[PDB]
Design a protein around this nucleic acid. Structure first.
Lengths: 89, 92
DNA sequence: AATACCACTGGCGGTGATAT
DNA sequence: TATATCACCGCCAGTGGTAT
């Protein structure tokens, strides 16, 4: 698969690190998160591990489950989500 | 590969509301489907497919087109506007 | 367990030409 | 023209099976 960009790989590392810090307090695993995003565990592993790119919807759903802001792992997707909101206001 | 899914009733109605706005506003704003395609970085058949309900709007596209046509997304697509506000709830 | 690896495919979001 | 509607398909996110 084409490598993702270094910024995209950094967002995936910040995202997975939050999951490792919060997984026991929030009672999570890759398969339960898979279920909440209606996806499979290997679909989640690919996002956590910088194999498949994060998009604005997946990131927004993961930020909600993990109780963090999107900007905590992806400043650029958070930038994007804010631009689109300028169009609904 | 070949596959394309048919749009839903809702996606067709959004498309139909977006083309209407464009027709109501194109020369007051000085727009054609190829100026718009250029604005959006694609060709006139790309825009053609969106206005004519062949390809479905996504949130990024719907937000660029809203800004350019100076409407809010909800004027042609409440469900994408609701989807965009649900994403915003995660950055605020 | 819980997660990672790997080959694979559906459909997203287009393209250019041509017909109207 | 300006638009609509062909035929066409690259690409990669997500899969599901299996291994660690």
């Amino acid at each position: 698969k084409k490598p993702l960009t270094q910024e995209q790989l950094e967002d995936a590392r910040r995202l997975k690190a939050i999951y490792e810090k919060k997984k026991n307090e929030l009672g999570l695993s890759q398969e339960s998160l898979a279920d909440k995003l209606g996806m499979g565990q290997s679909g989640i592993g690919a996002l956590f591990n910088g194999i498949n790119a994060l998009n604005a919807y997946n990131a927004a759903l993961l930020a909600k489950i993990l109780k963090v802001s999107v900007e905590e792992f992806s400043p650029s997707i958070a930038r994007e989500i804010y631009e689109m909101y300028e169009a609904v206001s």
